[PDB]
């Protein structure tokens, strides 16, 4: 059901054909992403024995993948529920919690990337407790703060989501956006320590194609950082139709992107798999 | 047993030509990189040339670059070093060294008189 | 017994191990001032200088395949032993067990090189015939009041080392050349920055960002 | 300079050359007999049931 | 003159020795063993995966009870394991983290170390206070210690990087005997079952059999063409297998005074690191630089099994005294038990 209710702050009316096409592409994207994340999870599980995996990075990646898988499965179930009844009433806040957990794990991805890239010393430390308390604890705390103040907001609208008219949807938008913006601030910094590195490789061979990886290193960072969610915030503008299309397609193929950029194109994972064969 | 016998050399007129041969036995000559190292009187061992397994990669020290040439024949397991335009600085003992590691690019064969994979060498001197 | 092992693992991962390699009269000991420890920006570097063994370096060097970096100190003033230093650097760079370890090159005693090249008794062209067909790199940054001849010679030596460094693959490991005087208090900072760069490159390789 | 080392090496070679050597066939037969006699006592050569196997 | 005659006479002695060895080679060992049936495929599973070491492990040595084990790692740790329960019996930090060898006493009361520190450290495990301390610090070697084996609780045989071996007395603390003659660095040694003789392999592509009491090089074998990395006697004590960097293994017999079999394959280009024999000597286990071990039939010179699971170079390999299982340690800081 339009898949963009997650980050839709302003209510908008769209044509029936546009709605059905966006709903269908969201359905197929979520169906592909669920299978991709299942494959990623089983690949992580079978390869957990190898010491190359489990460097405190793959644990966070698996947690984020599981959170996104649960959120997408719950949303797909939610797409066929009539609003008003108590199953949708509790399942709306369940989706809220399981999406805030995914955003918290995205923030953990960003913080770990910043620590392991910028503050290069001290990265090989023990931060499992803080990471697990941020990924799973902070979403629970903010959700508890949420439903206690306004429980009736969940499921009020036609969707099993926070009502737009009451304005409570900001309780999801305000923290999640804060996750993205910070993840943006780290991202540019990462670029500032990558393209310059390409500059070190620019005076030895004189190949402009090196700049290409500067874009490539950016691209692989979109799925874990989740920058594209800002497109939903852009629903306020007049050209909201194309922004909503891009938001829906990117955040529905996020699982496939994660599987492609962390299981297939990861040379470390390829070597680990080849060692076991 | 690994044997590296050096032949040729002796007293040569300055600016002349000379040929040094290295016969290798006890191992497959084609699977190892070969080196030529010279020791001057009152001086330590110094690497002067090297040739890879297939002969595609050949390198020389700065003092002999272009002046000397090196070649290998794996059919009869032999090494050749041809020296042209000899100079008084070339008066030294020459050793044909087969460094131990096969199918590798680097190897150590310049050790101070303690090396089991080096030949006895030949003396090359120039007339006054 | 497990808690003690956990603390041992933490302290082992906290410190970074470096291997000091340099022939005699190069001045390897003077670089920082048979193990030495120092701390920069609250991270500990432990440098190991093996000097109690024989000239057979083929076997025991395999013990240093997990060090953070190899601090290779070379004297750029003695135009004679230079070739032995180049051969040693090439052997270290092209090692099967040292192909993943970066090398930080320290051209020690730049001043002695300066007096030797202004003296005119010895010419680089006699030992390096390609020095005549060489020009100072454009990107080279000279000091204020610094002779073109000394910078030309030192950058020729640096480029001669860099040719060997770039002959093999540079993606797995890189070389960081530096100019060192007789005494310098910035050597620790340079080592810390080079280690920063090496570990960042390794992290990016793990992230597939490079 | 190395006369003493060469003399010691050649003396060691002379000492080594004095010992006699038996035929290869006899040594081969002895090794075969040992392998065939101790074959039944080798846990690696002959599979062992998990009940009698401490590791498995 | 005298010196040229010295090399000439040494060369003629070598030629005479070669001719005598060729004359003694009446038949090959491979054809004699053709009549017996092949051993067949050998299948081993990783019963235990020992974890806890931080850095790469070089040395291990099984106990006489076939249950206790010792391992040495570059983190500076010598760990004594209980293989049955995978429990750390002991974990001793070392003064020098550059350790390349370790030993376990036959009585089990002592262990040994040694590495780049040029010193062999002997630790006592049966202290009254129940705490492991440095029992003795044997020094006097001018090269790195590559191997050490306990003859008994009183004397120990070690090999150093100065191309020399030394038999030390623990009570005295000094070199009781010194064995010299190797040209290259001595990398490993093995003790014969009769305890009277021992072989040593060096970086001169040759092995030397020495008598403990005599203190002289009893015998010399020159069959390899590269650095020798490992050596081990046959269980009968009349033969030994040697592994070298030339990606080949060679079996020598003390009485035959020459080579018996060569174990190699075209696809193998990685040098040998560790070798060991089975209880009956039928199976020869060899570690390789290709991250996996190979089990060959010692009587047919054909590969009978492959042991895979290590993602780094295999450094140490050891078979129990009763042949129950074989432990392999690699540069991945893990030990694997196979049975």
Author numbering:
A (entry chain R): 545 to 821
B (entry chain N): 1 to 128
C (entry chain A): 26 to 58, 208 to 254, 265 to 394
D (entry chain C): 7 to 62
E (entry chain B): 2 to 340
Study text:
Adhesion G protein-coupled receptors (aGPCRs) are essential for a variety of physiological processes such as immune responses, organ development, cellular communication, proliferation and homeostasis. A defining feature of the aGPCR family is that most of the members are autoproteolytically cleaved at a highly conserved GPCR proteolysis site (GPS) in the GAIN domain, which has been suggested to be critical for the maturation and function of these receptors. The cleavage results in two noncovalently associated fragments: an N-terminal fragment (NTF), which includes most of the extracellular domain; and a C-terminal fragment (CTF), which contains a small part of the proteolysed GAIN domain and the transmembrane domain (TMD). To uncover molecular details that govern the tethered agonism of the aGPCRs, we determined the structures of ADGRD1 and ADGRF1 in complex with different heterotrimeric G proteins.
To obtain stable ADGR–G protein complexes, the entire NTF preceding the GPS in ADGRD1 was truncated, whereas for ADGRF1 the GAIN domain was retained. Using cryo-electron microscopy (cryo-EM) single-particle analysis, the active structure of ADGRD1 in complex with miniGs and the structures of ADGRF1 bound to miniGs or miniGi1 were determined. The extracellular part of the TMD is in an open ‘V’ shape with a crevice formed between helices II–V and helices I, VI and VII, which allows the tethered stalk at the N terminus (T545–L558 in ADGRD1, T567–P578 in ADGRF1) to penetrate into the receptor helical bundle. To enable interaction with the TMD, the stalk in ADGRD1 and ADGRF1 exhibits a stacked structure, with its N-terminal half (T545–V553 in ADGRD1; T567–S574 in ADGRF1) lying in a binding cavity within the helical bundle and the C-terminal half adopting an upper position to cap the TMD pocket. Although the positions 6.48b and 6.49b are conserved with two hydrophobic residues in both ADGRD1 and ADGRF1, the residues at 2.50b and 3.50b are charged in ADGRD1 (H6052.50b and E6533.50b) but apolar in ADGRF1 (M6272.50b and L6783.50b). Thus, the helix II–III–VI interaction core in ADGRF1 is associated purely through hydrophobic contacts, whereas in ADGRD1 H6052.50b and E6533.50b form an extra salt bridge. Similar to what was observed for ADGRG3, the H6563.53bA mutation of ADGRD1 abolished receptor basal activity and suppressed pD1 potency by 79-fold. In ADGRD1, the bulky side chain of H6563.53b is required for making contacts with the neighbouring helices, whereas for ADGRF1, the association between helices II, III and IV in this region is also mediated by a lipid molecule. A similar binding mode of palmitoylation is excluded in ADGRD1 and ADGRF1 owing to a steric hindrance caused by the sharp kink in helix VI. Consistent with this, no lipid was found in this region of the active ADGRD1, which has a bulky tyrosine residue at this position.
